[PDB]
Nucleic acid binder design. Structure first.
Ligand SMILES: Nc1nc2c(ncn2[C@H]2C[C@H](O)[C@@H](COP(=O)(O)OP(=O)(O)OP(=O)(O)O)O2)c(=O)[nH]1
Length: 627
DNA sequence: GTCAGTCAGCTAGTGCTGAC
DNA sequence: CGTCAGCACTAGCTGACTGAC
């Protein structure tokens, strides 16, 4: 059949027909600013669509490429970019189709698999690398990862997804595909009924490419309607900062962090042997052999028939640590808690890491998402590296590459600094500029001791109670916030005394608490001005959103600045979890990397917070687990 | 010889339960 | 709190073991 093979020469199979070739005029601008009447072939659909979204497109094959098409990109200010891939695993998937939507022109689509010369793509690379031109990508993370992997460079992003979700204010957490936003903001239906059609095949059908072009083309009108809204609410700053953190996250994902195989295997052997002997000990201790040692109800029944009683002689009803922490008297309970802690560590960490280690490179690669979190913080997906245990300093399994070196840094008490900025309290400014940690000052006011006498044991109470009441936490509940968590223990009278004392001096915190309680607004804001709306008033969330949001924003600015500066020495940003940036560099450059890091984070802090200085604790470590 | 009816193993799902 | 993983229990599905006139 010639009808299906009508345009087979361009590597397109005409499955559904419904297209027609066209060769018309295009008035481009010559490099000498001379208007030239160059003509370009372009296909079009016979069946029209009711929407105004553009649907035309040129296919530029190696045998069909012409130099004059490159003139179209001249003088532009922005363009679209939609990339098609054969799969989701970036390390082992090949970029199929790269579209560009240039305004008042059809979408240029590069059939990559048929492009066998480097002289074609460099025209696209020059556009991608220039910072003066803005780029628009739906979910820019994925396309940026694939591009950077395959030897491209893209130097400006305007993620419509980020603008949409920041305008959503975390009201609806789903419905952010391209169709959703396009319907909500453009009154157009894209008809994305493509059920993930076959892509690895060299030949491609007409419907697939035509619908792919529209998904690329619609983004320009979406950007025009989005920039007006984002400027309307004065959310320009947050969008500007958030768009530039796409590239650092991409570099973290593509680099990842290496894992030591031999150390991990050795650790598995020792922990497994210890688990076996301890499980045998427990099974002996329970006085019965049929018990499945894991089951909560079975072990609870075993304890109950073993006559395990509390201080008041009452039988145990729960195995919760918050309940079992007070029942340390029994010999069996110590072994039981030991067993369960060891099993949690084993299953969570040692059986899980071998599943997520790439044998091809011996590296672990996370998946990072930025606005997925309520407060806007980073969340580590798949291997949740926010979840790697801190016990034993298990991070020594992780290491840098064969010859490089880790240089980690972290903010020292960023959260309380943000509180100091927002509340405008004189005492916290006094303490900070006098070079005294707010934990130390809190301990001093609690104990009324002289300044150097704030020992670690005393400072623990301050460290707990500060974070306790800085978020408006009930003084009755401080007993429960202590008895179960951290290492505090008190009574009601002392709870009341501490609650009175803290707000006796920290006038700013009291004022902030009273106003946040009174207003009861459905909306709250940060220093970076990101906006969120809660379904109903809630004291704890209402207090916690601004401080932690600004803390996240400072880290994001630090990340973009660090990407900007590190390029000279070929540095790479590896991981960041909780106010802690980890970079990597080959030896002989450490003396410079330390300075670049501290300067970048200092400028980051100086941008947002003016009154109070920052203080960055920096260390250079052979392994992530260095003390 | 055959086919309902009750007996199921299994599959899924919500409930509930401990962990840094 | 958030998260994830892990385990009973309860209820519905898809074939095997009868029971028969
Ligand atoms: N108990 C508790 N811990 C949380 C919660 N969310 C996060 N965390 C963890 C991760 C945070 O990084 C950590 C708070 O302690 P940090 O590690 O930030 O300590 P800090 O920077 O004060 O360290 P330093 O005093 O210098 O040793 O607690 C939560 O809701 N409850």
């Amino acid at each position: 059949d010639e009808i299906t093979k009508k345009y087979i020469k361009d590597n397109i199979i005409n499955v559904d027909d419904n297209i027609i070739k066209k060769k018309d005029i295009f008035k481009l601008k010559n490099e000498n600013n001379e208007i030239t009447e160059c003509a370009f072939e372009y296909f079009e659909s016979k069946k029209k669509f009711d929407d105004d979204i553009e649907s035309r497109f040129f296919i530029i094959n190696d045998n069909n490429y012409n130099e004059n098409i490159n003139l179209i990109y001249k003088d532009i200010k922005y363009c679209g970019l939609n990339i098609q891939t054969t799969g989701l695993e970036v390390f082992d998937e090949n970029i199929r189709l790269i579209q560009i939507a240039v305004e008042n022109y059809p979408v240029i689509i590069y059939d990559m698999f048929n492009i066998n010369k480097k002289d074609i793509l460099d025209g696209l690379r020059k556009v991608l690398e220039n910072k003066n031109i803005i780029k628009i990508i739906q979910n820019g993370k994925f396309d940026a990862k694939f591009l950077l992997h395959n030897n491209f460079k893209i130097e400006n992003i305007f993620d419509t997804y980020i603008a949409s979700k920041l305008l959503d204010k975390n009201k609806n957490m789903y419905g952010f595909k391209l169709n959703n936003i396009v319907e909500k903001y453009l009154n157009v239906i894209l008809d994305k009924q493509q059920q993930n059609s076959v892509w690895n095949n060299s030949l491609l059908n007409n419907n697939q490419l035509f619908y792919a072009a529209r998904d690329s083309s619609c983004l320009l009108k979406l950007y025009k309607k989005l920039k007006e809204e984002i400027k309307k609410e004065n959310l320009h700053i947050v969008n500007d900062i958030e768009n530039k953190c796409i590239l650092p996250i991409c570099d973290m994902e593509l680099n990842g962090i290496k894992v030591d195989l031999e150390n991990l295997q050795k650790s598995t052997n020792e922990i497994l042997n210890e688990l076996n002997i301890e499980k045998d000990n427990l099974k002996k201790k329970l006085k019965d052999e049929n018990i499945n040692v894991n089951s909560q109800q079975q072990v609870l029944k075993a304890l109950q028939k073993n006559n395990v009683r509390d201080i008041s002689n009452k039988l145990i009803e729960n195995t919760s640590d918050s309940n079992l922490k007070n029942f340390l008297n029994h010999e069996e309970i110590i072994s039981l808690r030991n067993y369960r802690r060891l099993y949690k560590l084993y299953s969570a960490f040692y059986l899980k890491l071998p599943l997520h280690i790439n044998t091809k490179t011996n590296k672990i690669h996370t998946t990072f998402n930025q606005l997925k979190t309520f407060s806007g913080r980073f969340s580590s997906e798949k291997p949740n590296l926010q979840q790697i245990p801190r016990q034993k300093n298990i991070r020594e399994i992780f290491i840098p590459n064969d010859n490089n070196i880790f240089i980690i840094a972290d903010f020292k008490q960023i959260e309380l600094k943000i509180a100091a900025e927002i509340t405008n309290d004189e005492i916290m400014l006094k303490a900070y500029n006098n070079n005294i940690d707010l934990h130390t000052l809190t301990a001093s006011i609690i104990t009324k001791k002289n300044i150097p006498d704030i020992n670690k044991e005393d400072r623990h109470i301050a460290k707990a109670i500060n974070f306790g009441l800085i978020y408006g936490m009930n003084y009755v509940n401080l007993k429960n916030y202590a008895n179960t968590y951290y290492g505090l223990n008190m009574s009601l009278d002392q709870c009341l005394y501490f609650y009175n004392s803290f707000f006796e001096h920290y006038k700013g915190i009291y004022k902030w608490h009273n106003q946040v309680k009174q207003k009861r607004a459905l909306q709250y804001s940060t220093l970076s001005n990101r906006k969120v709306i809660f379904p109903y008033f809630s004291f704890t969330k209402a207090l916690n959103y601004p401080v932690q949001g600004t803390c996240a924003d400072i880290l994001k600015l630090a990340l973009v600045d660090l990407y900007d500066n590190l390029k000279d020495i070929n540095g790479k940003i590896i991981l960041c979890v909780h106010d802690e940036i980890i970079i990597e560099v080959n030896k002989k450059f450490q003396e410079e990397a330390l300075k670049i890091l501290v300067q970048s984070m200092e400028n980051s802090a100086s941008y947002f917070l003016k009154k109070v200085k920052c203080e960055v604790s920096v260390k250079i470590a052979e392994n992530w687990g260095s003390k």
